[PDB]
Amino acid sequence: MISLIAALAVDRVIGMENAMPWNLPADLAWFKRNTLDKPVIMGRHTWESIGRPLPGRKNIILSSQPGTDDRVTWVKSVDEAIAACGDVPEIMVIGGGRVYEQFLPKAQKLYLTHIDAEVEGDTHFPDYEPDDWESVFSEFHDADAQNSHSYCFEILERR
Amino acid sequence: MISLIAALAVDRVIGMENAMPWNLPADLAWFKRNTLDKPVIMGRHTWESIGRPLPGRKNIILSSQPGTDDRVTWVKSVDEAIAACGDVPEIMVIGGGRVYEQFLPKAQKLYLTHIDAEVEGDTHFPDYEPDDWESVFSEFHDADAQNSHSYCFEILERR
Numbered sequence A, B: 001m002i003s004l005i006a007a008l009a010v011d012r013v014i015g016m017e018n019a020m021p022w023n024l025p026a027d028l029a030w031f032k033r034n035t036l037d038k039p040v041i042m043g044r045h046t047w048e049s050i051g052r053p054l055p056g057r058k059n060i061i062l063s064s065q066p067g068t069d070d071r072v073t074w075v076k077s078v079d080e081a082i083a084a085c086g087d088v089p090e091i092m093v094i095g096g097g098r099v100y101e102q103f104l105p106k107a108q109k110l111y112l113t114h115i116d117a118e119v120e121g122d123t124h125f126p127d128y129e130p131d132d133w134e135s136v137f138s139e140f141h142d143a144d145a146q147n148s149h150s151y152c153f154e155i156l157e158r159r
């Protein structure tokens, strides 16, 4: 099955190119715990934000352009990307925006981090109609010495 | 000599009730490059925020309270903190606010990172007179894929 994981600010704004104005190590640990040992599919901007292959995961880059690197798999289409993953229980789609747009319709699960931050932004996580999704897990956390803002982890299941 | 190093948001804000709302790996790399192989003096709250000893530097904690950790050196006064540095050419003071206020009078150099971020702070860098310091290095950078805000590196020397 296919899953989407993302960090959303107020109004569902997500990053486009520059790094988001927040510092949430708790959220990065959550991203890690949930994607480890799984293939991850991402767009070119996400690849640049990351800066190197995510370890312990199969890195698949979906893009209309040229693979600048031999350590990851570069695909030009969604079907190629899915194929690249092979036969696994869960495929993780890590963004950015267009990439989430493309896999949404095929997704069965969503791992979202809702962050209490108002950021001005162009892109938004695709519109998802909850009556179509079941919220099965939600856990809020306050900001602290290590996390710049309040955040709530949430898992949703496609009904 | 004694130097102070700090990251300042607009209005000299240096800390908030929670972690600062930004993600600036390049600033962190500049901090490391400038403190590596040097003794570092910090207050207890800064220490708590860090979590561990900074590798490759001698860590000195200035605080009225007793120890807590055996991997660093705990001191009770500024004189004590200085003496514990020994014979080194430059001592780095890394905050917070109170520590910076107390050591400014003896400092000859400032390594500052001005970050374009408007936040409500809790603590601020002490007020310094621009006429008393000479900027001998400055370098501006916009936010990018990995850094959330624009920032400018600056080194000032006491006139």
Ligand SMILES: Nc1nc(=O)c2nc(CNc3ccc(C(=O)N[C@@H](CCC(=O)O)C(=O)O)cc3)cnc2[nH]1
Pocket: A005, A006, A007, A027, A028, A029, A030, A031, A032, A046, A049, A050, A054, A055, A094, A095, A112, A113
């Ligand atoms: N929840 C969630 N949070 C995010 O921050 C997020 N980021 C992306 C894309 N951006 C990034 C940027 C960096 C790393 C990263 O360095 N992760 C390391 C963890 C290292 C660490 O814990 O510092 C990884 O190993 O997963 C991951 C995704 C996608 N989905 C997200 N989803």
Ligand SMILES: [Ca+2]
Pocket: B134, B135, B136, B137
């Ligand atoms: Ca100058």
Ligand SMILES: [Cl-]
Pocket: A042, A043, A044, A045, A046, A047, A095, A096, A097, A099
């Ligand atoms: Cl992308």
Ligand SMILES: [Cl-]
Pocket: B042, B043, B044, B045, B046, B047, B095, B096, B097, B099
């Ligand atoms: Cl402190």
